[PDB]
Amino acid sequence: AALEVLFQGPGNNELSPVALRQMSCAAGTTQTACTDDNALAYYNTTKGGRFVLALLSDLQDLKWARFPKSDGTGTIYTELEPPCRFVTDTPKGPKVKYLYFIKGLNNLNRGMVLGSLAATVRLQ
């Protein structure tokens, strides 16, 4: 989907990539409005479980997002940032999608995700 990077190697200087799997999830404008899969979330397969960076959806007033926990023993709601507007070439017609960074995600990851999206998916 979109390949981030991590500083590994003996001196914490080797660049190893990491692809990012994606999955569906629920978003809404409040916590109860998250009732149905209206969004695509970019995550990373860690050891503590699954860690979410940003959200991709057609709606523009979204504020929240709904995820099972690791092994779905409960449920988590994370606030989204104000959305980034862009235009991708979906294979069914050019489509306006919005990008939501999870609130808290740091700038270096915000930038890896963008330049990974700028290079891979076609923007406009």
Contacts with ligand ODN by CB under 6 A lie at 7, 12-13, 81-82, 84, 101, 107-108, 110
What is the nearest approach in angstroms of ligand ODN to the Cβ of residue 100? 8
**Binding site partner of 116, from ligand ODN, a second copy, none, Cβ cut-off 5-8 A by kind:** a second copy
Q: Can you give the binding site for a second copy, defined by CB under 8 A? A: 1-5, 7, 9, 11, 13-17, 82-87, 99, 106-120, 123
**Binding site partner of 64, from ligand ODN, a second copy, none, Cβ cut-off 5-8 A by kind:** none
Taking the least distance from each CB to a second copy, the nearer of 11 and 74 is 11
Q: Is 101 exposed, middle or buried (0-12, 13-18, 19+ CB in 10 A)?
A: buried
For residue 80, give the DSSP letter.
B
Give the C-alpha separation, 55 to 49, whole Å: 18
Would you say 46 and 55 are in contact if contact means Cβ atoms under 8 Å apart? no
**Binding site partner of 120, from a second copy, ligand ODN, none, Cβ cut-off 5-8 A by kind:** a second copy
- Selection from 42, 7, 25 nearest residue 76 by Cα: 25
> Would you state the torsion angle of the CA atoms of residues 32, 36, 38, 42, taken in this order, to the nearest 10 degrees?
90
**Binding site partner of 76, from ligand ODN, a second copy, none, Cβ cut-off 5-8 A by kind:** none
